[PDB]
Symmetry: C2
Amino acid sequence: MDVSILGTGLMGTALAQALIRSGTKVTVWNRTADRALPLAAAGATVAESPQSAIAASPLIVISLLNYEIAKDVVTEADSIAGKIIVNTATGTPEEANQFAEWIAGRGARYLDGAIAAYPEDIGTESSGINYSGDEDVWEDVQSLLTPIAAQSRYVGARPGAANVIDAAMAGAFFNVALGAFHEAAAYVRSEDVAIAEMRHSLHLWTDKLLELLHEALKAFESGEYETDQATLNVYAAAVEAWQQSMQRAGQRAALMTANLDNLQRACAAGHGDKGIFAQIETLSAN
Amino acid sequence: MDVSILGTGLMGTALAQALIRSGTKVTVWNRTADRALPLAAAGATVAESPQSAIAASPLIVISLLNYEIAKDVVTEADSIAGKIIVNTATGTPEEANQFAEWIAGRGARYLDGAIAAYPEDIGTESSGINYSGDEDVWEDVQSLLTPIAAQSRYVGARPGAANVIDAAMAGAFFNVALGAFHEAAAYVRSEDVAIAEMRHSLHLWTDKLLELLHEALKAFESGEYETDQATLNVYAAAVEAWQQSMQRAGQRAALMTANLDNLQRACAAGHGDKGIFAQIETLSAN
């Protein structure tokens, strides 16, 4: 089974490159056009149009800026029927559900995608893609798609699901975490301590965070926030003290305040004596 | 050279245990008292009092609740002179600077400590301790202390420095990051997506975060926030969209709002077109 990629903007290219070395006939197409030139040299048919691209292959992997564009690009096909559309655009679950219902109604199969990886990562161990939607579909493309990422996982029948998790992981968690470290290093610099001396500990802390993440997950699946050691109250105190120390250093410490606030709410709603994982119970705006 | 540990409350014990297997004479003491019983069985002289503990050995590693207690415990020694005091209590830099100046004035040498590790971690690879203060001292105890942690680093002549970084790393960064993931997983659960499907990606994301941390660090040392790809503006948009999506799901998304706020300030102060590492320039309360 052969595949066509709509979009060559670094990712799509990487996607393509991986698929060719995996052992598959590949056909590309790009609205920017010239940017797909190199792919030919690799070993990929380029294509006049969307229409010819769609027509070339039974599996179509979209790789375009957003959903609006991908809607517009496969509007130009006339018939997309009996084809598999695999859209790896990041966006809302709503966007993914609308677009899935649309593909379904032009007699096409769908699978929504979300890519945890830098373009350069795609061949290698440091790469993961999640998919959601008709599981029948994922079953029919696993073998063809798993090769291009180290980790490839069907994460649920809701089309919007890979987008929820990509939001959660890349936004809610990842980006905030990356800001937290800015607050951190700014504090360290404001105490005229050398920021460099935070270098050797980085991997200890990320190693520690990972463990705890797994543990938080366990405690979210279970109801069990059994105290065990350091309680909500303990943490609210420690963080208040850190906030203050950060504030006195002349740092808005906004992430910390938000962390504190989250933690106090958990205590004030009477979770003060459970484990930290119980701060989850008070994150609804209510 | 031999050592005495004041405090056996899990950590101190672990500290002790490690020091004995390293090949050192060890002498313990505990105010809770009974809790030091087992250490004897390992191979450690227990001690009537602080005074006898201090007196037993030239190097004294304190391991007590806070600084107030450690002040009170070595007030009871009469003479602490020509001894090395190594205090591994977490606290403010101020607390560390007061206490260092005090030890210095009873003719004793000081080194302030901060422990990135769970008690159980102490023997093993997953362990680090930072020290700050007179570097002459650290030079005289490196060989005796490095064995008990995988990573042991003198992080500056400011006594308060190990406490600044432990605040930064464990509070500003670590704890906030652990909250961010609560916001994350709460969002995922609120879209009736299964929280379990965030398990396999965890180590990819923590692996990614580590790299970026190193990179942020590079860009903080350098002035160089050269754009290179995704700009402040790009990120402010993505995060606003994520916030909204999280909000619409009925989530206070406070960490995200704070992250957004941090990011907008950076743009409004005209960094919109540099790399994300430039959000640091706008964290002062100003």
